[PDB]
């Protein structure tokens, strides 16, 4: 039973939420191999844990850059939430620690690469391929939302493909535990719900709008609202108009009209029946929700694997030194990390 499963998941989450794991490793315990990605205030590197020989993805955030970009509370949210969650499609945080200069989050390494890379290369995914990935996001949001968490940054760049072809959601930089409404303007332009652009209070319904954008992008090969500049994207989002490719099935279009819905009293995921309006939609008729959760469904794509520590499924980034200052930076700001 869903209700019973989620109640037990909440008991587990709250114990970790109230007493977060802290300072569980040191930088000297890892061998730095290669950069897997970059952000405005950090980078993610492939590392090898010497004591086990295991490979991990280490996020390194520069404390001073976090402060300049006013991301202190968001970074504390990211680590506090990621250390407390447990779901098959959420990447696991193995260790976390900090030093004079940086914050570090050591997570499972997901070798298949970003959904973004595969989607851009192939062009678009078939409806059954997109449906397989979408079902995993639906279940993941059902789990997160039950814990009063809002994700706020769904996009292919943040969805990694594992060795079994299943999704691993990474990047909890904008996730927040909130019972009421929230107001921060954050996320990625193409994925913003109209209520975020219009500076209204908003809630978990923004994640369901973002799911509509993701499904559209996976099935079309391009997002529903795009332009050269963010301002033009915002005008398209608020207009109340969406065009679908002629190859989209009738069921796919109907599902998307209900997710990409400006009216909050009409948006799927936000009604009296909640997530069940999505799970029971015609486009998901062939989906066995339990088999997806149990990972019993055959994946439509298995990434190529040359062996342990291989990064062939990732783009190459410029390599920079990890400098650790002799003086502690921003100690007070990151005391709880």
């Amino acid at each position: 039973s869903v209700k019973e499963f989620l109640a037990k998941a909440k008991e587990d989450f709250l114990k970790k939420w109230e007493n977060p794991a802290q300072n569980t490793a040191h930088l000297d315990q890892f061998e730095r191999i290669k950069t897997l990605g970059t952000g405005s205030f950090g980078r993610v590197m492939l590392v090898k844990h010497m004591e086990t020989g295991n490979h991990y993805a280490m996020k390194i955030l520069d404390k001073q850059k976090v402060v300049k970009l006013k991301q202190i509370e968001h970074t504390l949210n990211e680590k506090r939430i990621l250390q407390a969650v447990n779901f098959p499609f959420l990447v696991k945080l193995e260790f976390s620690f900090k030093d004079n200069s940086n914050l570090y989050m050591v997570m499972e390494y997901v070798p298949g690469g970003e959904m973004f890379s595969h989607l851009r290369r192939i062009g678009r995914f078939s409806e059954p391929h997109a449906r397989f990935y979408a079902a995993q996001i639906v279940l993941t949001f059902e789990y997160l939302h039950s814990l009063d968490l809002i994700y706020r940054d769904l996009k292919p760049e943040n969805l990694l493909i594992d060795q079994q072809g299943y999704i691993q959601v990474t990047d909890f930089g904008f996730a927040k535990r909130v019972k009421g409404r929230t107001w921060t303007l954050c996320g990625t332009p193409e994925y913003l719900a109209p209520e975020i652009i219009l500076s209204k209070g908003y809630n978990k319904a923004v994640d369901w709008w973002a799911l509509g954008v993701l499904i559209y992008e996976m099935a079309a090969g391009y997002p529903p609202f795009f332009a050269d500049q963010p301002i033009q994207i915002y005008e398209k989002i608020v207009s109340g108009k969406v065009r679908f490719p002629s190859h989209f099935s009738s069921d796919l279009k109907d599902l998307l009209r209900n997710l990409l819905q400006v009216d909050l009293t009409k948006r799927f995921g936000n009604l009296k029946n909640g997530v069940n309006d999505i799970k029971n939609h015609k486009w998901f008729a062939t989906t066995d929700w339990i088999a997806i959760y149990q990972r019993k469904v055959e994946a439509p794509f298995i990434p190529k694997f040359k062996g342990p520590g291989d990064t062939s499924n990732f783009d190459d980034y410029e390599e920079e030194e990890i400098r650790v200052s002799i003086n502690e930076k921003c100690g007070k700001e990151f005391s709880e990390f």
Binding site: Q71, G123, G173, C186, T188, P189, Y222, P245
Partner: peptide, 20 residues
């Protein structure tokens, strides 16, 4: 085509999030 318009746009690469 919409595909050709997307490919010729400046937003086919990795998209960064909004910051304050």
């Amino acid at each position: 085509t919409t595909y050709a318009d997307f490919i010729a746009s400046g937003r086919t690469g990795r998209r960064n999030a909004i910051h304050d």
